[model samples]
Target: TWLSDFPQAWAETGGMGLAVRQAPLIIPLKATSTPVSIKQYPMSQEARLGIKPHIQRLLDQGILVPCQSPWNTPLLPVKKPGTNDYRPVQDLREVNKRVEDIHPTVPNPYNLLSGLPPSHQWYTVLDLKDAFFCLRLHPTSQPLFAFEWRDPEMGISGQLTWTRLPQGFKNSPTLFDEALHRDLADFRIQHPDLILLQYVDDLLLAATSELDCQQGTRALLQTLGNLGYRASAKKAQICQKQVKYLGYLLKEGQR
Candidate 1:
C-alpha cells in the first residue's frame, strides 16, 4: 500500500514525466533471478543515459572539481495552522544578502552597436559544479541556521540536518566568489588573458584563444585541488570558441 501511494503521490506532484509507465515496461512472465535481454535504449535519448563527449573528455583529463553547497540557509517549517505535523522548506532571505549587486557589464544589443572592442577576442566558459558545497562554514557561525518544523495537527519536530550548505543564501555566492578570487590571486595565477567570472560555484573563464583557455582551466583546477576543493568533471565544459558565461553570449568578435 505504501508503494502504491508512492506512485500516486509522484504522479500528482508533476512527476508523471519521470513515471515508470511512461517508458517501455519490461514485464517478466516468470519469476527468475537471472537477467533477461532487453532491447537497448539509445544512449542519447535516455533521460539518464551516457555522458556527453566533452564531459567525458574532461573526466579523462582529471580537470574537473567536485563541490558542495556553501550556504547555511534555514529550512522553512511545514505545518498547517492549528496542526502539529511539519515539513521542511528553505529560507532564502539570509543567503540573498551576500550576492553581489554588480549589474552585468556585457553590453546589450543597443549598446553593442556603439560599443568598441579593444581588440579581437575569443571566449571559453567553465561551469563549476556544486560550487557552494566546496566551502566549509566558519565554525562559529554554523548555528545561526537553526530552523523548526511543525504540522498544526501533528506537532512540532526537530531541525533538519544539512548535508551541505545551500545555494541562494544571499551571502553564500558573495562569500564563495570572494574566497575563490582570493585563492586565485594568492596563487599569482590571475592573467589578463583570463577573465574569471563566477556566480555561486558556476565559474566561467573568458579567454582570447583555445590554448589560453585550456591553460587557464588547468591552472584553476590545480589551484583549487591544492586547496582541498574538488570539481565535477562530468559537468565541466571547456575551450569552446563560443560559449555562454554568466548569462552573456561570448563569441569570437568583441562588441
Candidate 2:
C-alpha cells in the first residue's frame, strides 16, 4: 500500500533517479594527476555471460555509454552471496589515486543514532536504490571512469564510461551524502517536528506518534520523488513501531 501510494518514489515504477536539483559533479584531479589506463582482466565464459545483462541494462538506462578515453579500469564480475546474481564492479584503484580527496561526512551508527530522542519511537526507513547513480557527472569528468567491455554476440566492443557519479570512486560516498543533505534541507526545515536522520542514501524518519510518522513518511517520499530520487520499495519499512536500521534494532527510542 505504501509502494502504491508513492509509486513515483519507488525504483520499480520510477527507474533510476537523477537528482535534478543538484548540479552535475565536476570531479577535480590531483595536482600531480596524470592519465592512467589499466587494461581489463580476462573474464571467464560464465562470468562474461553473467555480467552482460547488467551492462546492457545500464547502457539502456543511459547510466553508461560507449566512449574512447585515456582512462581504463577493469570491470569485475562479482557474484552475489548465496545467489546466482552477478554485479559489475569497476576497479578504481588507479583512478582513486589520481583524484582529489574530500572530507568524509558519513557518520557511524553510534553517532547517527544519537540524534534520536527517547520520546520518538515510531519510525520509517527507506534505502535509496543505486544511490550513486542518482548524482550526475559532468561530461568533462565522464571519461575519467571509462572501462573496457565487449559484447561479442551483439558485436559491440569499446570503452564504456559512466555519465553518473559511479560507485568505486573514492569520494562518491561523501559527495552523495552532501548532495542529499542539500536536497533534503528544505524538507528538514519544513518538518521540524519530525526527526530525519540521513546516512548517505539511507533515510530514517522518527516521530512521536504513528499518525505523525505516517504523515512524515508520506511527505518525505513525495519530496524525494520530486527531487528525482527513488527508494527501493521492497526494502522500505513504512511507519513501523519496530524496525531495523543501520544494523541495529530501533524501537521505543532504544537502539
Candidate 3:
C-alpha cells in the first residue's frame, strides 16, 4: 500500500536547485556594531591546496562574492572529520561576540524523543543539503562575514563575502532551525497523524503506519522542493521502521 501511495516520495530525498530559499533571517547587532578587520591565519601550501576546491565551488555557485569591506574574518583550514578534504572554516568567534546572539533554539534531545510512540511502524529522516546556505542573509549584514583568501601558488588573492548564511556563523543553527520550524507550520497542521522533530535543517518524521509515513514524507519533500530547498540524499535516513536521530540509534525498543 505504501509503495503505490507516493511515487514522489523516496527514502533518500533532496532538493534539486541551488537558489537561496526565501526566508526572513535578520542578524541583530548590538550598539557595538562597527567595522572589523581580522587578519587571516597563516596556512601551508598543502592545506591551501586542500581548501581551494571548496572555496572555488562556493564562489562558482554564487554563494560567495567579491567584496571590499571593513568587516573581515580569518579562515582556518579544518579537515572534514571522515574525509581527506579540508574545509575552509571562517573563525567567526570574534564576530559572533560582537553580534547579539539569537535566542538559543537548539532542540532539546530529551524533549525531541518524548512523544514518538514506540508503536510507530515507519519513519523518515530528511536533511537539507547545505541547510544554512538555503537561508538568505540580509544584504546589509553580509559584509560582516567577509574573509580574505590568497594563493601563493597562483599569485591571486582577494576578499570574498558570503551572500548566504555561511556554515560557521554562530547564529546559523538557531536561525535555520527557527526558519524551518516556521516553514513547516502548515505541513504539521495538515498531517496530524505524523510526528515531526526538527533540529536545524534535519527533520525526523514518525508515524504508526507505512502509508501514513510515506504520505507525510511525500508532502514534506514536495513542500521543501517547492520552497527552493533540497534534501541531501547522502545524509538522508528515510522510510524505515527504526533509524538514527540526533546521533542516537533507534532499534529494538532501545534508544
Using lDDT as the measure, the top candidate is: 2
List candidate 1 segments past 4 Å from native: 1-88, 92-120, 148-157, 161-165, 187-193
Compose the digit string of candidate 3's lDDT tens values, residues 1-255: 332443233334432243334554568787877877998878888788898888888888778888888889899878867646787888888788889866796768777777777777588887777778877777888888999887775634578988788877888888777777777788889988888888877788988888888777878877776666677666667678878888878775466
**Candidates, ranked, lDDT:** 2, 3, 1
Please report, as a residue range, the 10-residue window in candidate 2 with the lowest summed lDDT: 149-158
lDDT of each: 0.43, 0.91, 0.76
Please write out the lDDT profile of model 2 over residues 100-211, one tens digit for every residue. 9888889987999999998888999999999999999999999999998886576466889999999999999999999999999999999999999999888999999999
Error of 3 at 94 (Å): 0.7
Q: Any residue pairs clashing in model 3, and if so which?
A: 14-231, 15-230, 15-231
TM-score winner, 1 or 3:
3
Judge candidate 2 against the unseen true structure and give its global Cα lDDT, from 0 to 1.
Answer: 0.91
Off by over 4 Å in 2: 81-83
What's the lDDT for candidate 3? 0.76
